[PDB]
PDB file of all heavy atoms in Angstrom:
ATOM      1  N   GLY N 168     155.604-245.502  69.892  1.00 25.27           N
ATOM      2  CA  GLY N 168     157.025-245.572  69.726  1.00 25.27           C
ATOM      3  C   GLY N 168     157.411-246.509  68.502  1.00 25.27           C
ATOM      4  O   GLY N 168     158.308-246.110  67.611  1.00 25.27           O
ATOM      5  N   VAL N 169     156.635-247.634  68.224  1.00 20.87           N
ATOM      6  CA  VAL N 169     156.770-248.460  67.079  1.00 20.87           C
ATOM      7  C   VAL N 169     156.237-247.694  65.898  1.00 20.87           C
ATOM      8  O   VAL N 169     156.966-247.641  64.842  1.00 20.87           O
ATOM      9  CB  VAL N 169     155.827-249.801  67.263  1.00 20.87           C
ATOM     10  CG1 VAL N 169     155.630-250.432  65.907  1.00 20.87           C
ATOM     11  CG2 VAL N 169     156.564-250.661  68.231  1.00 20.87           C
ATOM     12  N   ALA N 170     155.222-247.029  65.979  1.00 22.39           N
ATOM     13  CA  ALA N 170     154.546-246.178  64.845  1.00 22.39           C
ATOM     14  C   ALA N 170     155.438-245.047  64.371  1.00 22.39           C
ATOM     15  O   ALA N 170     155.477-244.810  63.229  1.00 22.39           O
ATOM     16  CB  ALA N 170     153.233-245.769  65.291  1.00 22.39           C
ATOM     17  N   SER N 171     156.248-244.448  65.325  1.00 22.96           N
ATOM     18  CA  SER N 171     157.109-243.394  65.052  1.00 22.96           C
ATOM     19  C   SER N 171     158.339-243.697  64.098  1.00 22.96           C
ATOM     20  O   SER N 171     158.940-242.737  63.478  1.00 22.96           O
ATOM     21  CB  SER N 171     157.731-242.665  66.252  1.00 22.96           C
ATOM     22  OG  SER N 171     158.761-243.521  66.798  1.00 22.96           O
ATOM     23  N   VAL N 172     158.497-245.010  63.924  1.00 22.78           N
ATOM     24  CA  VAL N 172     159.662-245.631  63.102  1.00 22.78           C
ATOM     25  C   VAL N 172     159.076-246.151  61.864  1.00 22.78           C
ATOM     26  O   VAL N 172     159.615-245.977  60.816  1.00 22.78           O
ATOM     27  CB  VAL N 172     160.485-246.608  63.933  1.00 22.78           C
ATOM     28  CG1 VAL N 172     161.355-247.494  63.059  1.00 22.78           C
ATOM     29  CG2 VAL N 172     161.259-245.863  65.090  1.00 22.78           C
ATOM     30  N   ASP N 173     157.914-246.959  61.932  1.00 24.14           N
ATOM     31  CA  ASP N 173     157.334-247.739  60.783  1.00 24.14           C
ATOM     32  C   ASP N 173     155.903-248.042  61.227  1.00 24.14           C
ATOM     33  O   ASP N 173     155.609-248.970  61.986  1.00 24.14           O
ATOM     34  CB  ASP N 173     158.133-248.924  60.457  1.00 24.14           C
ATOM     35  CG  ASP N 173     157.624-249.614  59.252  1.00 24.14           C
ATOM     36  OD1 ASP N 173     156.527-249.331  58.730  1.00 24.14           O
ATOM     37  OD2 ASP N 173     158.394-250.597  58.697  1.00 24.14           O
ATOM     38  N   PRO N 174     154.882-247.300  60.839  1.00 27.82           N
ATOM     39  CA  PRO N 174     153.464-247.497  61.249  1.00 27.82           C
ATOM     40  C   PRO N 174     152.897-248.898  60.606  1.00 27.82           C
ATOM     41  O   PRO N 174     151.830-249.263  60.892  1.00 27.82           O
ATOM     42  CB  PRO N 174     152.649-246.389  60.685  1.00 27.82           C
ATOM     43  CG  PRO N 174     153.657-245.246  60.370  1.00 27.82           C
ATOM     44  CD  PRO N 174     154.961-246.063  60.079  1.00 27.82           C
ATOM     45  N   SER N 175     153.684-249.429  59.692  1.00 23.50           N
ATOM     46  CA  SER N 175     153.294-250.675  58.965  1.00 23.50           C
ATOM     47  C   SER N 175     153.402-251.928  59.863  1.00 23.50           C
ATOM     48  O   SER N 175     152.775-253.014  59.576  1.00 23.50           O
ATOM     49  CB  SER N 175     154.154-250.833  57.681  1.00 23.50           C
ATOM     50  OG  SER N 175     155.171-251.698  57.805  1.00 23.50           O
ATOM     51  N   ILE N 176     154.203-251.821  60.941  1.00 23.65           N
ATOM     52  CA  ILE N 176     154.365-252.887  62.039  1.00 23.65           C
ATOM     53  C   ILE N 176     153.219-253.139  62.815  1.00 23.65           C
ATOM     54  O   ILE N 176     152.563-252.083  63.355  1.00 23.65           O
ATOM     55  CB  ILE N 176     155.632-252.522  62.885  1.00 23.65           C
ATOM     56  CG1 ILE N 176     156.937-252.385  62.124  1.00 23.65           C
ATOM     57  CG2 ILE N 176     155.766-253.575  63.937  1.00 23.65           C
ATOM     58  CD1 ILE N 176     157.993-251.805  62.833  1.00 23.65           C
ATOM     59  N   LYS N 177     152.686-254.351  62.805  1.00 24.37           N
ATOM     60  CA  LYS N 177     151.549-254.759  63.598  1.00 24.37           C
ATOM     61  C   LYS N 177     151.926-255.109  65.048  1.00 24.37           C
ATOM     62  O   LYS N 177     152.938-255.741  65.293  1.00 24.37           O
ATOM     63  CB  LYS N 177     150.852-256.068  62.979  1.00 24.37           C
ATOM     64  CG  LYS N 177     149.498-256.342  63.490  1.00 24.37           C
ATOM     65  CD  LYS N 177     149.022-257.720  63.361  1.00 24.37           C
ATOM     66  CE  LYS N 177     148.267-258.292  64.490  1.00 24.37           C
ATOM     67  NZ  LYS N 177     148.082-259.776  64.360  1.00 24.37           N
ATOM     68  N   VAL N 178     151.235-254.522  66.051  1.00 27.19           N
ATOM     69  CA  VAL N 178     151.372-254.785  67.535  1.00 27.19           C
ATOM     70  C   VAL N 178     150.235-255.478  68.019  1.00 27.19           C
ATOM     71  O   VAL N 178     149.146-254.987  68.147  1.00 27.19           O
ATOM     72  CB  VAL N 178     151.481-253.337  68.188  1.00 27.19           C
ATOM     73  CG1 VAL N 178     151.707-253.559  69.821  1.00 27.19           C
ATOM     74  CG2 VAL N 178     152.709-252.572  67.661  1.00 27.19           C
ATOM     75  N   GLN N 179     150.516-256.811  68.303  1.00 28.68           N
ATOM     76  CA  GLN N 179     149.439-257.828  68.938  1.00 28.68           C
ATOM     77  C   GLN N 179     149.558-257.466  70.385  1.00 28.68           C
ATOM     78  O   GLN N 179     150.474-257.680  71.074  1.00 28.68           O
ATOM     79  CB  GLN N 179     149.786-259.282  68.602  1.00 28.68           C
ATOM     80  CG  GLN N 179     148.873-260.228  69.168  1.00 28.68           C
ATOM     81  CD  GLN N 179     147.459-260.139  68.680  1.00 28.68           C
ATOM     82  OE1 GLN N 179     147.162-259.920  67.580  1.00 28.68           O
ATOM     83  NE2 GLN N 179     146.574-260.199  69.674  1.00 28.68           N
ATOM     84  N   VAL N 180     148.274-257.113  70.847  1.00 28.47           N
ATOM     85  CA  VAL N 180     148.137-256.919  72.416  1.00 28.47           C
ATOM     86  C   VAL N 180     147.210-257.922  73.005  1.00 28.47           C
ATOM     87  O   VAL N 180     146.181-258.241  72.371  1.00 28.47           O
ATOM     88  CB  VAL N 180     147.471-255.406  72.507  1.00 28.47           C
ATOM     89  CG1 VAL N 180     147.163-255.155  73.940  1.00 28.47           C
ATOM     90  CG2 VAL N 180     148.332-254.397  71.901  1.00 28.47           C
ATOM     91  N   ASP N 181     147.556-258.493  74.087  1.00 27.74           N
ATOM     92  CA  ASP N 181     146.784-259.532  74.858  1.00 27.74           C
ATOM     93  C   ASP N 181     147.070-259.350  76.351  1.00 27.74           C
ATOM     94  O   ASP N 181     148.226-259.060  76.758  1.00 27.74           O
ATOM     95  CB  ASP N 181     147.214-260.937  74.467  1.00 27.74           C
ATOM     96  CG  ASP N 181     146.703-261.275  73.147  1.00 27.74           C
ATOM     97  OD1 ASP N 181     145.489-261.369  72.827  1.00 27.74           O
ATOM     98  OD2 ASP N 181     147.658-261.442  72.162  1.00 27.74           O
ATOM     99  N   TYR N 182     146.058-259.391  77.181  1.00 25.33           N
ATOM    100  CA  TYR N 182     146.208-259.284  78.649  1.00 25.33           C
ATOM    101  C   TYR N 182     146.100-260.588  79.330  1.00 25.33           C
ATOM    102  O   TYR N 182     145.229-261.444  78.904  1.00 25.33           O
ATOM    103  CB  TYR N 182     145.155-258.161  79.025  1.00 25.33           C
ATOM    104  CG  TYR N 182     145.665-256.733  78.843  1.00 25.33           C
ATOM    105  CD1 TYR N 182     145.538-256.196  77.571  1.00 25.33           C
ATOM    106  CD2 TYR N 182     146.248-255.957  79.884  1.00 25.33           C
ATOM    107  CE1 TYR N 182     145.924-254.795  77.402  1.00 25.33           C
ATOM    108  CE2 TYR N 182     146.596-254.689  79.706  1.00 25.33           C
ATOM    109  CZ  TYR N 182     146.543-253.990  78.446  1.00 25.33           C
ATOM    110  OH  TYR N 182     146.928-252.711  78.333  1.00 25.33           O
ATOM    111  N   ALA N 183     146.653-260.750  80.477  1.00 25.06           N
ATOM    112  CA  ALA N 183     146.723-262.120  81.154  1.00 25.06           C
ATOM    113  C   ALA N 183     145.550-262.034  82.288  1.00 25.06           C
ATOM    114  O   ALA N 183     145.176-263.140  82.762  1.00 25.06           O
ATOM    115  CB  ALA N 183     148.010-262.398  81.781  1.00 25.06           C
ATOM    116  N   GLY N 184     145.091-260.814  82.758  1.00 28.77           N
ATOM    117  CA  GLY N 184     144.334-260.631  83.742  1.00 28.77           C
ATOM    118  C   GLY N 184     144.844-260.811  85.260  1.00 28.77           C
ATOM    119  O   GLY N 184     144.137-260.801  86.230  1.00 28.77           O
ATOM    120  N   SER N 185     146.248-260.835  85.330  1.00 26.37           N
ATOM    121  CA  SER N 185     146.857-260.996  86.554  1.00 26.37           C
ATOM    122  C   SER N 185     148.411-260.622  86.400  1.00 26.37           C
ATOM    123  O   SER N 185     148.959-260.735  85.351  1.00 26.37           O
ATOM    124  CB  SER N 185     146.873-262.582  86.987  1.00 26.37           C
ATOM    125  OG  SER N 185     147.680-262.763  88.179  1.00 26.37           O
ATOM    126  N   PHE N 186     149.007-260.290  87.464  1.00 28.64           N
ATOM    127  CA  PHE N 186     150.474-259.902  87.639  1.00 28.64           C
ATOM    128  C   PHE N 186     151.234-261.167  88.260  1.00 28.64           C
ATOM    129  O   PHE N 186     152.475-261.001  88.350  1.00 28.64           O
ATOM    130  CB  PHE N 186     150.693-258.669  88.482  1.00 28.64           C
ATOM    131  CG  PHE N 186     150.201-257.393  87.792  1.00 28.64           C
ATOM    132  CD1 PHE N 186     149.071-256.589  88.288  1.00 28.64           C
ATOM    133  CD2 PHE N 186     150.733-256.869  86.638  1.00 28.64           C
ATOM    134  CE1 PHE N 186     148.634-255.547  87.566  1.00 28.64           C
ATOM    135  CE2 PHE N 186     150.315-255.831  85.947  1.00 28.64           C
ATOM    136  CZ  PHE N 186     149.189-255.053  86.444  1.00 28.64           C
ATOM    137  N   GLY N 187     150.567-262.168  88.699  1.00 26.99           N
ATOM    138  CA  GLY N 187     151.172-263.448  89.296  1.00 26.99           C
ATOM    139  C   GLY N 187     150.735-264.653  88.650  1.00 26.99           C
ATOM    140  O   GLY N 187     150.631-265.638  89.436  1.00 26.99           O
ATOM    141  N   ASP N 188     150.630-264.800  87.332  1.00 25.59           N
ATOM    142  CA  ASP N 188     150.244-266.059  86.521  1.00 25.59           C
ATOM    143  C   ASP N 188     151.100-266.281  85.387  1.00 25.59           C
ATOM    144  O   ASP N 188     150.804-265.894  84.150  1.00 25.59           O
ATOM    145  CB  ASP N 188     148.771-265.716  86.004  1.00 25.59           C
ATOM    146  CG  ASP N 188     148.043-267.009  85.507  1.00 25.59           C
ATOM    147  OD1 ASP N 188     148.732-268.038  85.354  1.00 25.59           O
ATOM    148  OD2 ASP N 188     146.767-266.910  85.220  1.00 25.59           O
ATOM    149  N   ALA N 189     152.287-266.904  85.799  1.00 29.12           N
ATOM    150  CA  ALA N 189     153.336-267.240  84.800  1.00 29.12           C
ATOM    151  C   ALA N 189     152.707-268.191  83.620  1.00 29.12           C
ATOM    152  O   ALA N 189     153.109-267.788  82.454  1.00 29.12           O
ATOM    153  CB  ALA N 189     154.479-267.910  85.493  1.00 29.12           C
ATOM    154  N   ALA N 190     151.921-269.107  83.987  1.00 28.84           N
ATOM    155  CA  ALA N 190     151.273-270.014  83.079  1.00 28.84           C
ATOM    156  C   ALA N 190     150.565-269.304  81.882  1.00 28.84           C
ATOM    157  O   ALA N 190     150.736-269.814  80.837  1.00 28.84           O
ATOM    158  CB  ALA N 190     150.476-271.054  83.755  1.00 28.84           C
ATOM    159  N   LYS N 191     149.931-268.254  82.237  1.00 30.17           N
ATOM    160  CA  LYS N 191     149.113-267.478  81.339  1.00 30.17           C
ATOM    161  C   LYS N 191     149.969-266.654  80.322  1.00 30.17           C
ATOM    162  O   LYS N 191     149.802-266.593  79.198  1.00 30.17           O
ATOM    163  CB  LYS N 191     148.034-266.679  81.988  1.00 30.17           C
ATOM    164  CG  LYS N 191     147.032-265.878  81.073  1.00 30.17           C
ATOM    165  CD  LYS N 191     145.944-266.799  80.533  1.00 30.17           C
ATOM    166  CE  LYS N 191     144.781-266.060  79.900  1.00 30.17           C
ATOM    167  NZ  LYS N 191     144.770-266.476  78.535  1.00 30.17           N
TER     168      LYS N 191
END
């Protein structure tokens, strides 16, 4: 969706390893 408008935009991806860890 980001790429369809401007592929120059950088998308930083990071996973928390949990659905119940607010602090992470």
Side-chain angles (χ1 to χ4, degrees):
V169 164
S171 78
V172 166
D173 187 349
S175 101
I176 298 165
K177 192 202 140 192
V178 180
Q179 178 62 42
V180 178
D181 292 294
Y182 281 80
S185 179
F186 293 112
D188 189 354
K191 187 76 168 121

